[PDB]
Design a protein around this ligand. Structure first.
Ligand SMILES: OC[C@H]1O[C@@H](O[C@@H]2[C@@H](O)[C@H](O)O[C@H](CO)[C@H]2O)[C@H](O)[C@@H](O)[C@@H]1O
Ligand SMILES: OC[C@H]1O[C@@H](O[C@@H]2[C@@H](O)[C@H](O)O[C@H](CO)[C@H]2O)[C@H](O)[C@@H](O)[C@@H]1O
Ligand SMILES: [Ca+2]
Length: 131
């Protein structure tokens, strides 16, 4: 139990190890599971010890928002190397979740991953893959 999490299976956004976000909340979704939300510019969540194996070059996140925003994917810390940026257009509602993807620089081994938020968005989960 609680072995190293794979980059290639969904990582629940509420399963962060550390964060910056005084108003950030975890809440239940109608369809099952939970999301993070009540996010503001400059908030972040950190996911320790994610096993990328011998590499991933894409990320997909299941997200909801009413206004275009971005989610930076960074290595180690909120000011660490920028791996890529997910562009999150409106999903019409904070309750309507859709999958959005972005390229990242090749990331391998066991790494700490940080999501850095530029504005309001709700996140259910995210996952990596080889493009
Ligand atoms: O799976 C990652 C780790 O998650 C830890 O739980 C986090 C808490 O430490 C923190 O206080 O809150 C967040 C949000 O609820 C939790 O995800 C576990 O305690 C670890 O055992 C686990 O490795
Ligand atoms: O209504 C639930 C959602 O509320 C969102 O916050 C909104 C802010 O983004 C906006 O600036 O103000 C309105 C008015 O209160 C807020 O609803 C949260 O960001 C979402 O996480 C939440 O799902
Ligand atoms: Ca979730």
């Amino acid at each position: 139990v609680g072995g190293t999490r794979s980059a290639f299976s969904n990582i629940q956004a509420e399963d962060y190890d550390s964060s910056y976000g005084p108003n950030l909340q975890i809440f239940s979704l109608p369809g099952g599971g939970s999301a993070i939300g009540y996010i503001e510019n400059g908030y972040s969540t950190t996911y320790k010890n994610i096993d990328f194996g011998d590499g991933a070059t894409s990320v997909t996140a299941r997200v909801a928002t009413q206004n275009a925003t971005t989610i930076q994917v960074r290595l180690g810390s909120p000011s660490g190397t920028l791996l890529g940026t997910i562009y999150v257009g409106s999903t019409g509602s904070f309750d309507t979740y859709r999958d959005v993807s972005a390229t990242i620089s090749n990331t391998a081994g066991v790494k700490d991953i940080v999501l850095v938020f530029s504005g309001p968005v709700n996140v259910d989960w995210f996952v990596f893959s080889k493009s």
